Each structure stands twice: as C-alpha cells, then as structure tokens.
Design a protein around this nucleic acid. Structure first.
Ligand SMILES: [Zn+2]
Ligand SMILES: [Zn+2]
Ligand SMILES: [Zn+2]
Ligand SMILES: [Zn+2]
Lengths: 72, 73
DNA sequence: GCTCCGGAATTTCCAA
DNA sequence: TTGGAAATTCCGGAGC
C-alpha cells in the first residue's frame, strides 16, 4: 500500500509507478517546470512522509529511477 | 561585504548577538518560540545558503545555535 | 535629523 | 481551496 517514493500510502498507480498523492502532485511540475533542484546533502537524502519536502532534488531523483514518466 | 554567518547572504545587521541576514533572523525567532522538531534528511551537515536554506530547517537551526544566536542579547 | 535592532504585521509561497 | 511557514516590509523605542 506504500508509495514507492515517500512510503506514505499510495493513492493509486500514476505515471507508471505506485505512489501517493503529494508525490503525485510533485513529479508533476518538476518535469515541465524542468527544475534545477540542488541538494544540500550528498544526493543520497532520505525520502519519507514528513521529510519529502526537504530535498526536491533527491525526491525527484528517486521518482525517476522508480520509473515515473509522462506516457501510457 | 556585510555577509551572514548562517545562510551566507548579505547581513541586515547584528541580530540576536550574531551578524546575520533578515531571513535567518525571523527564522531563528520562529524556531525558538515554536518547536525544533525538524528532522534532517541528510547527515546533519547540510549546506546552508539562500537557495538551500529552506531545505533543512534542522541544520539551519543548528547553525544558528552554533553561531551563538540567543533571544536576549 | 540620524543609526541600530526587535518585532509585529503584511505579503509571498507552497505543500497536501 | 485551507492553513502553515517562509521572507520582505515597516514601525516602536533606545540612543546618539
Ligand atoms: Zn509519495
Ligand atoms: Zn538530497
Ligand atoms: Zn541568513
Ligand atoms: Zn540537514
């Protein structure tokens, strides 16, 4: 039932991956925002429920290598 | 010149005992009266600057305390 | 007249 | 939206 990104509960499978609501209003506007997103860490930041908003960079990263894309 | 000891932006003036910008001033003020409960998603060495400073409240708050910031000064 | 600082009130911002 | 946190702006009072 877990979002494969933030490990909150999934609202369904969107963009080819099972994840949550916020994680699926997030990928989302990073792509056609085509955003910068610099990490203040090592690029290995932990992504979970209340930390997910700390590092958009690592969050966006983890989105991609879970396979999220705009296509179907 | 004139540059903040915390978020590394240009300093409004000495605030709470530490030369700092205005952003960190009201950040620190808000942190001490409220809760600290912030978590770091990194190793607690996170880099703080104008773009990065909003990423990790935890590390930013730590730097303020490290800098010597205190409410009565 | 000014400088300096705390700080409240206001606006900007964005996540959920 | 609905509400919380960020940040710029502005005012009160101690000084000088
Ligand atoms: Zn998620
Ligand atoms: Zn990161
Ligand atoms: Zn600062
Ligand atoms: Zn951190």
């Amino acid at each position: 039932k877990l979002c494969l990104v933030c490990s909150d509960e999934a609202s369904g499978c969107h963009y080819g991956v099972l994840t949550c609501g916020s994680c699926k209003v997030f990928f989302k506007r990073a792509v056609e925002g085509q955003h910068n997103y610099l990490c203040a860490g090592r690029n290995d930041c932990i992504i979970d429920k209340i930390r997910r908003k700390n590092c958009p960079a690592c969050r966006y990263r983890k989105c991609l290598q879970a396979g999220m894309n705009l296509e179907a």
